[PDB]
Homo-oligomer: A and B are copies of this chain.
Amino acid sequence: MAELACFCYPHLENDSYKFIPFNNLAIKAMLTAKVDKKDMDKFYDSIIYGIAPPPQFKKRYNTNDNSRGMNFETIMFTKVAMLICEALNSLKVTQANVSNVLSRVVSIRHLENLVIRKENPQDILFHSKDLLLKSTLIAIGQSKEIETTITAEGGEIVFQNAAFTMWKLTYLEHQLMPILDQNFIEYKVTLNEDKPISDVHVKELVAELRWQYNKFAVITHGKGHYRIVKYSSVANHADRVYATFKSNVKTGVNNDFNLLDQRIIWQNWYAFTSSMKQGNTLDVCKRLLFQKMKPEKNPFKGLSTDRKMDEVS
């Protein structure tokens, strides 16, 4: 999780801002550099290895005294940086915008997964440059469009339906910036199409979720997909999405939040995010999260039995 300015710098050629990747040794030089307090937000000249990121983003890079950043000396750093550049170079970014664009924080893991998609001959992104660009621009946050199956970050498909595709996020196996907590398990459910989903297809998804992923809560962060997370993590997710909601309200940036199908989402999460979306306080929202809520209409009552009896037969 870091700024785009961690991967590339802008260069004005042909009266246009083309973005160029960093050499890892330039980053390595900057980390050893003595810079003025008033130059910490300026791009650094390594002399030998070209331009380097602003010294203020020192903590974004893993060193001996830091394991909270990314592994910039890997090959995947260059791949991700190239992906970012390719995407930004298509936008023809104006002089006023370059700073805002680069200061945008994005998911490095999302970008890494997109690299893993684009490089696989089997994946549609390998063949469609347009789909790759759409996918990347969503990840960059320079796109109004929603992440769907076609434009998903990726992972191992663990379930698929007419309406849905479930992915296991393999963040443990990443090169650039993995999850270090070995307990980490998280899935996501992307919609295949935006057109209306049937009751039968929703039933099929909820069936698999209640059977295979019973120890997981079904939530969302307001974009067009579900997040399958351990119940032990929900409280932290709540804090994050509320902080985001709060931040977007204060800064005036888009604050749309798709609560998604109420029959699929976890009751308490839907309550939480509904209160948040109504403009209630963190404590008001959080307190619903922990309430032993009176069981709603299921709304699919015989669903867990069906799969058991199928397995027996």
Chain A interfacial positions (CB closer than 8 Å to B): 23-26, 28-30, 32-34, 46-50, 64-65, 117, 120-124, 149-150, 152, 157-161, 165, 182-183, 192, 204, 208, 211-212, 214-215, 217, 230-232, 234-235, 268, 289-290, 292, 295, 302, 305-306, 308-309, 311-313
Contact = CB atoms under 8 A, between A and B. Distances in A.
Contact of A64 (B121, B160, B182): B182
Contacts of A192: 47
B309 A49 contact: no
A312 B234 contact: yes
Contacts of A212: 215
A259 B43 CA distance: 34
Contact of A157 (B28, B124, B295): B28
Contacts of A302: 292
Contacts of A165: 47-48
A24 to B, nearest CB: 7
17 contacts: A23-B121, A24-B122, A29-B157, A29-B160, A32-B157, A32-B158, A47-B149, A48-B123, A48-B124, A48-B150, A48-B165, A49-B124, A217-B308, A231-B311, A292-B302, A292-B306, A292-B309
Contacts of A121: 23
A13 B231 CA distance: 47
Nearest to A311: B231
A234 B158 CA distance: 25
Given A182-B64, A232-B312, A292-B309, A34 B208 contact: yes
B308 A34 contact: no
A49 B183 contact: no
A121 B121 CA distance: 27
A183 B65 contact: yes
Given A160-B46, A161-B33, A231 B312 contact: yes
Given A165-B47, A214-B214, A231-B308, A32 B160 contact: yes
Contact of A160 (B33, B292, B295): B33
